[PDB]
């Protein structure tokens, strides 16, 4: 019944092979998507070190610059690049063809990343760092890594939106096992936390009953309790607010995929959804404020790798190993009606159409 629509809309936008990208530089350590506006791609043609930047409002039009760097992360709203060549980092304004800034570290940068319009991440061997793109502050050490995450490959660095709560999550192989090691930092108590996860995000989500939103994290692990995810309130609720009540609910693998597990998440705070893409390429979609799983579906025949908030349509992008970039969001006319009549949850339901009527 009702199996003619989805709660969803998958799109394809674009296949990177058709733009002259070699798919041996289709991936993790060469291909960065620091939001939906650009694709930024590492290529060695001939002797030639080159970044290949892709303009997702122009794409057919790719423009390639000889740059030796390590890596190149394009800022999420402008026409700003970080670059890095071992412990020498620069960020150049492109429009105006001029450096902006430059630091030399005294540790590797391991990681690196945007976390907003104007602040990149810096992950060393045992340290966080903020550095403004804005005048001439050296980076700043956020916090010490813990050792929990000694060891690990670097996957994702985030924050809430106040930049009060800090997430490092970090994998490493143990035996024939992906295991997931997150590390989240409170600001203002200067606390770690070590917590067993494979993929998360922030969220900010207003409760029935609160005039203030509440700042939620949530996280998702396939451990050896199987599949779960979490959405916890982090940080003193706002004054006048209840407090968001704990959800914990279960992460579903079918049973040809005991080998499959969370790599990439992003929230909708317009339809207040989790998506949670896993790596075999399955997308599931839960509601942030129950964690009820709304739909799950095999989206991509190869693993997504990198992902970014899709803002017009408040949905996910990401880009997968064969350089498809795809993308899932909310279809608004037909996911209360596929939650009514195939999911039957008419709590839901309600919940969903009293926040769209506002
Ligand atoms: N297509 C494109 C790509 C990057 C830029 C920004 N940009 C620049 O605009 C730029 C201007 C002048 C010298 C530069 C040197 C270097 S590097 O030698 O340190 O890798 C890098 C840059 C640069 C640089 O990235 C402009 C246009």
Redesign the pocket.
Known sequence: FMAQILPIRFQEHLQLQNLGINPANIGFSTLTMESDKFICIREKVGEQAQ?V?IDMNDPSNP???P???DSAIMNPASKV?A?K?GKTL?I???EM???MKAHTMTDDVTFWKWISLNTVALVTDNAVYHWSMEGESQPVKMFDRHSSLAGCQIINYRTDAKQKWLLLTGISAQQNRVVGAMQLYSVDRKVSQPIEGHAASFAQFKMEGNAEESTLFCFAVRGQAGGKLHIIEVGTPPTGNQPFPKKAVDVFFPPEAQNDFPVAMQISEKHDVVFLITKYGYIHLYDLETGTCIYMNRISGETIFVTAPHEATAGIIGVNRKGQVLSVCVEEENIIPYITNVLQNPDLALRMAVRNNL
Do not use: E, G, W
């Open positions: 970044v930047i423009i390639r610059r740059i030796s760097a690049i670059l060549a620069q150049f304004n492109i063809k001029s450096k």
